[PDB]
């Protein structure tokens, strides 16, 4: 699934 | 599917206020990072503003060209993004994505013109 | 602010033939292990559509044909077959800190 962040988010 | 629907742009006289807007669904909207990004043929895509999850106690950061004007937030209740736009100035007019888990989902955008 | 700068401006490519369009980052955009650098293609009168995570990771439904490459502060996509409705501008952008920036964007035009 996605993440909080989303994909494009940070790490 | 996802959906974000933007809402609230228009025409403002500069140093006046407005409130964007953004309804979104499809995704577990609490868990969601959210943020506003910009576009002008002038200055490109801008990101303007972010608000994290209730994880991130709902922390939010600005681009330095808006910061003490603009105020991010959230309503994970009825899955809205909301953008207070104050003191607004000519170079503040783009159209407005709010975009959904920082950039994987974008909305159609709205457009902000700021002029007398 | 970590300043992104595509290459080239615009760029007209063959149908079923490569295409290539770069992005460079004024530092590394290395967090950990991944270069945390994204691409976005936005058609005419649309939004942004998600393309590219983590400099070559594809996103969900994106074609076999969109692949990134590259790591630290030098970055290409790669469109190869390029078909009619890749014509479009194309955005690097960054995500290893805040301020997330964008590149100025690059069109593909579509040789017909």
């Known amino acids: 699934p996605p993440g909080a962040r989303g994909l494009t988010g940070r790490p | 599917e996802v959906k974000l629907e933007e809402s609230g742009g228009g025409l403002v006289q500069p140093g006046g206020s407005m409130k964007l807007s953004c309804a979104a669904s499809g995704f577990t909207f609490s868990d969601a990072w959210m943020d506003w990004v910009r576009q002008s043929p002038e200055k490109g895509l801008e990101w303007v503003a972010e608000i994290r999850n209730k994880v991130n106690n709902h922390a939010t950061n600005y681009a330095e060209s808006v910061k003490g004007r603009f105020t991010i937030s959230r309503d994970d209740s009825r899955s809205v993004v909301y953008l207070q736009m104050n003191n607004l100035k000519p170079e503040d007019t783009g159209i407005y994505y709010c975009?959904?888990?920082?950039?994987?989902?974008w909305g159609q955008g709205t457009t902000l013109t700021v002029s007398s | 602010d970590i300043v992104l700068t595509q290459s080239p401006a615009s760029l007209a490519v063959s149908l079923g033939q490569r295409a290539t369009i770069s992005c460079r980052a004024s530092e590394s955009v290395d967090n950990y292990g991944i270069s945390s650098m994204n691409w976005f293609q936005q058609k005419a009168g649309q939004p942004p559509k998600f393309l590219i995570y983590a400099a070559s990771k594809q996103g969900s439904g994106v074609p076999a044909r969109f692949s990134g490459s590259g790591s630290g502060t030098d970055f290409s996509l790669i469109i190869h077959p390029v078909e009619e409705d890749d014509t479009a501008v194309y955005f690097c952008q960054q995500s290893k800190g805040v301020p997330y920036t964008f590149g100025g964007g690059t069109k593909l035009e579509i040789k017909r």
């Open positions: 975009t959904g888990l920082t950039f994987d989902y």
